[PDB]
Amino acid sequence: GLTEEQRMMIRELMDAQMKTFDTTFSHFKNFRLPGVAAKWSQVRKDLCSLKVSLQLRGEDGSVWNYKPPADSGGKEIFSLLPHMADMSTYMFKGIISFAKVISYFRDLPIEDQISLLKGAAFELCQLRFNTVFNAETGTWECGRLSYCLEDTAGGFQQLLLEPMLKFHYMLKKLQLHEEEYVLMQAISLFSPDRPGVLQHRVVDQLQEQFAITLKSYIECNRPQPAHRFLFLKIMAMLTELRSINAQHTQRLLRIQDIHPFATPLMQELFGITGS
Ligand SMILES: CO[C@H]1/C=C/O[C@@]2(C)Oc3c(C)c(O)c4c(c3C2=O)C(=O)C=C(NC(=O)/C(C)=C\C=C/[C@H](C)[C@H](O)[C@@H](C)[C@@H](O)[C@@H](C)[C@H](OC(C)=O)[C@@H]1C)C4=O
């Protein structure tokens, strides 16, 4: 059974999620849209994991649909960078508000709150994006905005080679509850091994508490044989998400060095100083 203090942890996390996750993206406004050396080969490969079409459903009932251009060894590959930067900044703001609401997070020193956010901002955004991912149609449904994957060789199987895309399909197949999602966000946020963290011992003790609560939650509410080892499956996904976060950070900094795109908030989260 869940202890009274374990139920207390879930309530505060669910409360922080309810207050800071705009599930309909109704406040995502004024975003940019596409127009009406060996570094580039890596940059061409880094961005070629896009292949995503975009749909705006109008409030009046109209629909705008965008189909991306093909790779032509030119500049067209940067067409969605400004829009993805605005979407990321919107989600990053939501992640920062989520952590600030949590009491266990607000009680840490300011220097460590910054270090934990800089290290987990991407991972918490991926976990929130998974809850709006439609694995049947390969589409992230962000309210009036939709991001649909376009067919690109070997159907969905040659697309699952992309680690970020494989993560979303595998995490969605576990059919997690809202409480399990917010506990994964807490475990990833309170990672003591993030660079720059001073209170390692405290953040580690908090992370173990969040993992124990998630473990106990699964034992009490999922007795089916399909959910055997579900806690261990979840922790394996969080380990893979940390690896994807490291791969993604390097691809981000390589593109920024060739073609600037990062908003001021992203520059702050990835260490760019402006000089
Ligand atoms: C911080 O990352 C952001 C900014 C990157 O800047 C740039 C410059 O560097 C990137 C790196 C390193 C990448 O590998 C990729 C992109 C970009 C950038 O444009 C990209 O444009 C599209 C990719 N692929 C896709 O189209 C896929 C597979 C799915 C399409 C739609 C989904 C709805 C999204 O994937 C979201 C689930 C989310 O992942 C995405 C909004 C993400 O924002 C966040 C907060 O995670 C940004 C990519 C991709 O592979």
From Swiss-Prot:
Its main location: nucleus. Expressed in liver, colon and small intestine. Keywords: Activator, DNA-binding, Metal-binding, Nucleus, Receptor, Transcription, Transcription regulation, Zinc, Zinc-finger. Disulfide bonds: none annotated. GO terms for molecular function: DNA-binding transcription activator activity, RNA polymerase II-specific; DNA-binding transcription factor activity, RNA polymerase II-specific; nuclear receptor activity; nuclear receptor binding; RNA polymerase II cis-regulatory region sequence-specific DNA binding; RNA polymerase II transcription regulatory region sequence-specific DNA binding; sequence-specific double-stranded DNA binding; zinc ion binding. Residues 5-274 form the NR LBD domain. One of its GO terms (biological process) is xenobiotic metabolic process. Heterodimer with RXR. Interacts with NCOA1. Interacts (via domain NR LBD) with CRY1 and CRY2 in a ligand-dependent manner. This is Nuclear receptor subfamily 1 group I member 2. It comes from Homo sapiens. The lineage of its organism: Eukaryota, Metazoa, Chordata, Craniata, Vertebrata. The chain holds residues 142 to 434 of 434 of the full protein.
